[PDB]
Design a protein around this nucleic acid. Structure first.
Lengths: 290, 83, 211
RNA sequence: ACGAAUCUCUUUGCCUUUUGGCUUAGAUCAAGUGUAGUAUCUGUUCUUU
RNA sequence: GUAUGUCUAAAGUUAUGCUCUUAUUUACUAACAA
């Protein structure tokens, strides 16, 4: 509906702040993380990075005070919201494709790598340059992880078409998922009971999983019809974008709704402090808001 | 009907499809350049594609017509039943 | 519970057996037996032979046929298989006629579901495994593409890794022509055509690049 | 009405995804549990359509 | 438990009707225990 030119270089990683979130954090393919607000007067506060490569996976803590950041040169960096002077992790084996912090305590902090070894970093343990414990039950590059929202349980899908429910720190698969499907983007629906862990596939079909209990995994109804190379997010409704053309709103109950034009790319999100406002993440400074 | 007859009969047909609507030799090279109408060759190309397309869609219809287990068996029982 | 086989032929069971027979034929009685959780191989085969086979008959005998029967009895004393053969009927039925003349569902549904499942599953483990590997392979490929594509979007061009060649003379077919067996040498000249096709090819490549 | 073209169907023709070896039918048909997973069951409640 | 088969092992090639909650079965599998 209304636009904003953000990142001239292609790829982007648009995400709001948590629940009470007036802000629009981006961090594109132009190796620069940037900050704009929900108030139409779009005010720029550029969190410049240091590391050479483009910034990939950006996510906030529950506190909304420090946001994590992942790049291609084996570099994860934590980032304080307004200031941006903060703890840093220059050194890894190679790129961590996806990263997430704990939704109950900003201290604990998971980073997920291409080599298929997942890493903890608490606040005092980030000071130690250590790990609480690693995970090594995925063998392919994982590129995908998000917490069961109570802070304890933790999920991370992977390139080998396998999803893994874990306990926060136990490093022992509560459940490996079925084989014949494919998975890419893991996101929990803001489900009133909070049973549901949704995830986008390679084969044009977003799935749903009964995450409580973690051992439950029978999908009820599958969201078909979004030629996928991208991303998807929920609030009633689930809105995910596709590779080729444009975004797709879907009734979470019945899996069918309007198909809004994008202009390509696709990373959808919802302004959670409001009831109805979306962000699209187009390639090359084409962020669309609704 | 033999492939002798079915050839000539199909020949006769495509002659009705026609009925609807220079040689230069370099003998040293052996290259017999028959410069002919480029519009007619294009009309062959489109017609021949259309003929093959018509046949291609003909099977598609006949495939979508309907004591078996899988796709092949159903047809295999149909190969038995025709006798 | 494990136990000794026998019992009585429930109609569903009979139907299942018939289906099996259609599938596996009249000489693999073990498999058919296996398909029936209650009934044995021998039992099954006997049943097929005696009752279930459609090339038997249970129509009543004509007066002439009756005569033939009872005459056979008179002449062949109680060799009823032979007698049956002579009649062209199954033997038990013949005997019965002669005698006449002289004067739970959950379980069943389980085996059904299993049965239908089996009959509609007609491949050795090698096949199943192979298709599994195929789909898995496909998935892997698409994931790889997603990475590569992602990087391209990101600005890093990564050439797709070759298949780790199994042997020294293993072929990649995009390198160069497979085994270019050329066309038969030109009687009619072909030069313009060569050009046009070349242009078409290059144009196609361009289109793909743009695509 | 004859000639032609386009479309649909029906009859035949074409088999058009239409069984790709051999052996002693190649051989032999079971006595299991709990623990876990997986699927499949069935019920079970309520929600709204 | 194996044959066997994949995987990893680091350096950037110069382009712009449904949801749910559960309890039960059965099957298969299991170098996991009995």
């Amino acid at each position: 509906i209304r636009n904003y030119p953000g990142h001239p270089e292609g790829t982007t990683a648009l995400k709001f702040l948590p629940k009470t979130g007036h802000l629009i954090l981006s961090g594109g393919n132009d190796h620069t993380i940037k900050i704009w607000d929900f108030y139409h007067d779009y005010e720029c506060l550029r969190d410049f990075q240091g590391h050479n490569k483009p910034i990939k996976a950006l996510r906030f803590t529950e506190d909304c005070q420090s946001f994590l950041s992942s790049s291609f040169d084996r570099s994860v960096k934590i980032w304080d919201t307004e200031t941006g002077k903060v703890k840093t992790r220059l050194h890894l084996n190679s790129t961590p494709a996806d990263v997430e912090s704990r939704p109950t305590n900003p201290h604990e902090f998971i980073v997920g790598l291409s080599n298929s070894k997942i890493l903890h970093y608490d606040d005092r343990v980030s000071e130690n340059q250590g790990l609480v414990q690693t995970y090594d039950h995925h063998l392919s590059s994982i590129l995908a992880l998000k917490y069961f929202p109570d802070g304890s349980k933790f999920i991370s899908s992977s390139e080998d078409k396998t999803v893994r429910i874990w306990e926060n720190q136990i490093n022992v698969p509560i459940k490996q998922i079925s084989d014949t499907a494919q998975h890419s983007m893991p996101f929990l629906n803001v489900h009133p009971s909070q049973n549901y862990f949704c995830a986008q596939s390679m084969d044009n079909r977003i799935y749903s999983f009964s995450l409580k209990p973690k051992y439950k995994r029978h999908p009820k109804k599958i969201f078909k019809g979004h030629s996928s190379a991208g991303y998807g997010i929920s609030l009633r409704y689930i809105c995910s974008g596709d590779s080729k053309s444009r975004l797709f709103t879907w009734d979470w109950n019945t899996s069918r709704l309007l198909n809004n034009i994008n202009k390509p790319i696709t990373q959808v999100d919802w302004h959670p402090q409001e009831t109805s406002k979306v962000i699209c993440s187009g390639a090359a400074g084409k962020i669309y808001v609704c | 009907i033999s492939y002798d007859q079915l050839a000539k009969l199909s020949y006769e047909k495509t002659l009705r499809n026609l009925a609807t609507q220079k040689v230069q030799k370099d003998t040293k090279t052996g290259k017999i350049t028959i410069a002919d109408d480029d519009k007619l060759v294009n009309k062959l190309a489109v017609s021949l594609q259309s003929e093959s397309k018509k046949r291609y869609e003909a099977r598609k219809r006949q495939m979508q017509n309907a004591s078996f287990i899988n796709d092949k068996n159903k047809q295999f029982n149909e190969k038995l039943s025709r006798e | 519970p494990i136990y000794v086989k026998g019992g009585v032929w429930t109609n569903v069971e009979d139907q299942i057996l018939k289906a099996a027979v259609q599938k596996y034929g009249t000489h693999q009685w073990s498999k058919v037996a296996s398909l029936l959780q209650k009934k044995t191989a021998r039992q099954s085969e006997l049943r097929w032979n005696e009752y279930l086979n459609p090339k038997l008959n249970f129509t009543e005998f004509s007066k002439e046929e009756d005569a033939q029967l009872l005459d056979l009895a008179r002449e062949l004393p109680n060799q009823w298989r032979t007698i049956a053969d002579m009649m062209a009927r199954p033997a038990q039925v013949c005997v019965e006629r002669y005698n006449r003349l002289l004067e739970l569902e959950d379980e069943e549904k389980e085996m059904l579901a299993e049965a239908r499942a089996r009959l509609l599953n007609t491949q050795g483990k090698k096949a199943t495994r192979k298709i599994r590997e195929r789909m898995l392979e496909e998935s892997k490929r698409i994931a790889e593409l997603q990475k590569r594509r992602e990087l391209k979007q990101a600005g890093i061009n990564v050439a797709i890794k070759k298949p780790k060649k199994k042997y020294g003379t293993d072929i990649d077919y995009n390198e160069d022509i497979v085994y270019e067996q050329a066309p038969m040498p030109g009687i009619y000249d072909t030069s313009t055509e060569d050009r046009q096709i070349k242009k078409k090819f290059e144009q196609f490549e361009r289109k793909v690049n743009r695509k």
